[model samples]
Target chain A: SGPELKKPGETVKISCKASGYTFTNYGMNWVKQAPGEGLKWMGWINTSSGKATYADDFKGRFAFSLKPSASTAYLQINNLKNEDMATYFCARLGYRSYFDFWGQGTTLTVS
Target chain B: LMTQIPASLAVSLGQRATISCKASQSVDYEGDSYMNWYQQKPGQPPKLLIYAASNLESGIPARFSGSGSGTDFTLNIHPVEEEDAATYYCQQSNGDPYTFGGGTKLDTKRA
Candidate 1:
């Protein structure tokens, strides 16, 4: 979670590490959902090329990045808003966008 | 684009069941061959059930099947069993920003 609680304008960074598999063999994606709300696609990072792609609404402040040396994917949300209080999940994409493996999920609480 | 699963559905064990996922835009096989389904149980990570419209992932039960080529897709579970009770999500990957359905909670009915 986000420090148990985070205030507005704070940043929330999540880490999703891959294991038992080659990180460069798959793509990494981030998903979000406000408490009890529908799921949302935050963005994704191309593990093979180190390129990142964000949804239109996530153009700024929301970054999908990777640290290949650590074999991890990261979702960075800056200047967090109350609406950003949600659970974020990381997943490994199969052919196209079918995600077969996933992270347990981390919840962010913004006040 | 977003995909939407029915909010909830109930089916009896051993009966034929069908779950639907409506996408915000066309995901026709001719246009984009990747459409997928996932099952997520409470407190557990999501499991990939089907990919590429109707291709079952390795180890998935034969009782589970998927159909439909466009915005309207259906996942069929014949002879439904107790283990089938869970939330199901649909996903699309034809475009850059992949999206997932809201998810449908399955409620099993037993006489």
Candidate 2:
């Protein structure tokens, strides 16, 4: 598949879509930002299928979802309760590696 | 700044489970509870969990609680509601070196 690339000062979030199989299939991995802004490794799926994994900072609080039919995957956070005001991204992985097919992060803010 | 979050954690309403943050040294410079937490749903951004330790900022659910004695502390939500089952995380502002706990993904005992 094609890897994701964005311009400087710009950000991209890659989403993964899976189908034709159960989540027992592949894995999803997030890597560090370009030039090493820091590891944006929001989280992951399963350890085996790589369905979801959160930052060491996050304890089973964040979430990631996989759709086997639409072959689509989603990373969602609930409560929008303020701190919920941070950009989130989705990614496709070849070896549970860095981001691929990233969408510009949805810049989130709290009122 | 090395950090660690338990593989998993759970708390009930009116209960307390420390969400600790560790650094090479004290994080007194950043003030108390020099960390933050987030809760994201399935298609949303993150929500901050804990900041400056014991104080739950304005607008946060009173059912949600956090406290710490020193380098180690906790984020306790009493009568953990169904909505609280998102994600919990901690961070340290111990200077140029910032770190996070592997996100603690959450689920409720009921529903």
Candidate 3:
């Protein structure tokens, strides 16, 4: 759902909206894939409590937020760099701990 | 990390396509395997096809199935169709910082 081109040093926010299901019932996880690279798990945010757990490499610059009333979650990347150019995805963490639904990726292009 | 075999596959319509993923360590926790499978077409995010190894996600077609456990898992698409041509990935959620395999690309050849 994206091709949000931005320059280095700027911040970008990506949103994922869910429908047909209870918004806070599952956790929302963020994943990244550099162009032609493999998928990488960035972290997850607990929809109910708004708590976030990030992967080691994504610890400092990434933030996860939510708007429960709108059934939407957001991933905000701060201090963007060229290396942050990738497609980002938001997924629903199912009851069994696996991702069951994924948003169409948002490609962030940092020049 | 998980290793996916045959980085790419070419199959005819109605034929079966099998993709294998081997995890670096056992993904089984308390008797349940945490392996899951996803399908991603170009320009789209991944869609969960199978989770916990063999359980198909709701709304997924019966022709798409998963098998195996522990460190090794397989995703089999019987009677591969043109719409089934995409990259398939395997992910394990048993440990922290859940990991995904390098996907296997599927190309369906028409008769």
Q: Give one digit per residue, the lDDT tens place, for model 1 in A1-111.
A: 333478987977788878888787778788876677567888877776767888776678887778767788877788887877777888887767578686877878889
Residue B82, model 1, lDDT: 91
Model 3 docking grade: medium
Residues A3-90 of candidate 3: C-alpha lDDT, one tens digit per residue: 4898987887788889888887777788989888688888777777887888867688888988888988888888888978888888
lDDT of 3 at A14: 85
Instruction: By TM-score, rank the candidates, best first.
Output: 1, 3, 2
Worst 10 residues of 1 chain A by lDDT: A1-10
Better candidate number, 2 or 3, judged by TM-score: 3
> Who is ahead in lDDT, 1 or 3?
3
Give the alpha carbon lDDT tens digit for every residue of B22-105 in model 1: 777776545555678888876676788889879989989998999985578899998898998888888888776788888889
Q: Please give the DockQ score of every candidate, comma-separated.
A: 0.77, 0.02, 0.65
Residue A53's lDDT within candidate 1 is: 85
Which fraction of the native contacts appears in each prediction? 0.88, 0.00, 0.72
Candidate 2: C-alpha lDDT:
0.49
| Best by the DockQ measure | 1
